[PDB]
Design a binder for this molecule. Structure first.
Ligand SMILES: CCCCCCCC/C=C\CCCCCCCC(=O)OC[C@H](O)CO
Ligand SMILES: CCCCCCCC/C=C\CCCCCCCC(=O)OC[C@H](O)CO
Ligand SMILES: CCCCCCCCCCCCCCC
Ligand SMILES: CCCCCCCCCCCCCCC
Ligand SMILES: CCCCCCCCCCCCCCC
Ligand SMILES: CCCCCCCCCCCCCCC
Ligand SMILES: [Ca+2]
Ligand SMILES: [Ca+2]
Length: 294
């Protein structure tokens, strides 16, 4: 304790920093290998790999019969990806969305609006089955319109990707396990200074990765990672949670998510996603974490 905490906390940070860059660089090479856009590889492989925390957290929480945590973490992640993650990235590297990716973003918007409507009375296991299938359909529709021996260039790409993903997922855990151990060693522990850490802990992979890609001017990869993770949270994390137990209705946050998603579409179609658009997202996020709950 106390001293393994500092060790775990910053070592996890080291793995998050370098792991994100490796995961980003590895994905960018894979995308060029399979002849797909950076958006696509971010909306799929990267998004799912980074949304694995939410999925396993929602499943565990719902099964341990705390479905409030399940949906709370899922929607809290979506809001965080648009407000915080996309907010920081847009400022770092402004994005002018092409006419093709606007179509993917509008589809994302419809998916989110649909989730919000069927979630008013909560999320039944049937609701989850529906969202999970749309999730699969989205992944395939996204890959198709972005598509078309022992190559050492491909192998090196896959290693960077996998080691990078391991780096950010383990790194997010050490960060999480390190901060938790510090608080208890210092007796300052509360347990929504409890489910504060993993709500943010699950979003650390998306954050660092998108920051990494933003440093390399990969706006498409960042945007894809944001869109994909959110869908992977609703159609993936939220869905699995409903399979174990009915999820309580979070209508306030859904409205917030719908509003942020609507804005994201509008900016992508008629404007750009740069400095002042990113500033708005951050402000909304800061208001959200200053006014919301659960
Ligand atoms: C576009 C909006 C489509 C909205 C479709 C709503 C279907 C519906 O009302 O489903 C109710 C059910 O109780 C949900 O679990
Ligand atoms: C608005 C704050 C709601 C706080 C929670 C209790 C609300 C009352 C419970 C049932 C009444 C009808 C609730 C209707 C909720 C509609 C959907 C919504 O609020 O989210 C965005 C919408 O789906 C985009 O189309
Ligand atoms: C995948 C796209 C899903 C769009 C919403 C479908 C339900 C309405
Ligand atoms: C590919 C994953 C498929 C998951 C299907 C989960 C079905 C869960 C059904 C739970 C039923 C609980 C009792 C309802 C009366
Ligand atoms: C930005 C539009 C308003 C968002 C809520 C503001 C609440 C008071 C701060
Ligand atoms: C932001 C306004 C909602 C903040 C959270 C708590 C519950 C009541 C919302 C009423 C609208
Ligand atoms: Ca995540
Ligand atoms: Ca429902």
């Amino acid at each position: 304790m106390v001293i393994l905490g500092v060790g775990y906390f910053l070592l996890g940070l080291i793995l998050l920093y370098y792991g994100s860059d490796w995961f980003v660089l590895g994905s960018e090479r894979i995308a060029r290998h399979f002849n797909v856009s950076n958006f696509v590889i971010g909306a799929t492989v990267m998004a799912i790999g980074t949304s694995l925390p939410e999925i396993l957290t929602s499943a565990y929480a719902s099964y341990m019969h705390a479905p409030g945590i399940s949906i709370g973490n899922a929607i809290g992640s979506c809001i965080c990806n648009i407000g915080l993650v996309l907010g920081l990235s847009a400022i770092i590297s402004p994005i002018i969305v092409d006419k093709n990716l606007q179509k993917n973003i509008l589809v994302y918007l419809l998916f989110v609006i649909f989730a919000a409507v069927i979630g008013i009375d909560g999320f039944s296991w049937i609701d989850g089955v529906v969202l999970l299938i749309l999730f699969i359909i989205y992944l395939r529709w996204t890959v198709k319109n972005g598509s078309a021996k022992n190559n050492p260039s491909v192998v090196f790409s896959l290693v960077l990707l996998i080691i990078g993903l391991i780096g950010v997922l383990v790194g997010a855990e050490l960060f999480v396990d390190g901060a938790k151990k510090i608080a208890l060693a210092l007796d300052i522990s509360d347990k929504v200074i409890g489910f504060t850490l993993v709500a943010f802990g699950t979003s650390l992979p998306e954050l660092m990765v998108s920051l990494a890609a933003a440093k390399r001017n990969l706006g498409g990869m960042v945007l894809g990672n944001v869109i994909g993770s959110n869908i992977a949270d609703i159609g993936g994390a939220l869905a699995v949670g409903s399979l174990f137990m009915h999820l309580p209705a979070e209508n306030v946050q859904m409205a917030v998510l719908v509003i942020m998603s609507l804005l994201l579409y509008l900016f992508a179609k008629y404007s750009k996603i740069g400095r002042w658009q990113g500033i708005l997202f951050l402000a909304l996020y800061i208001i959200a974490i200053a006014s919301l709950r659960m």
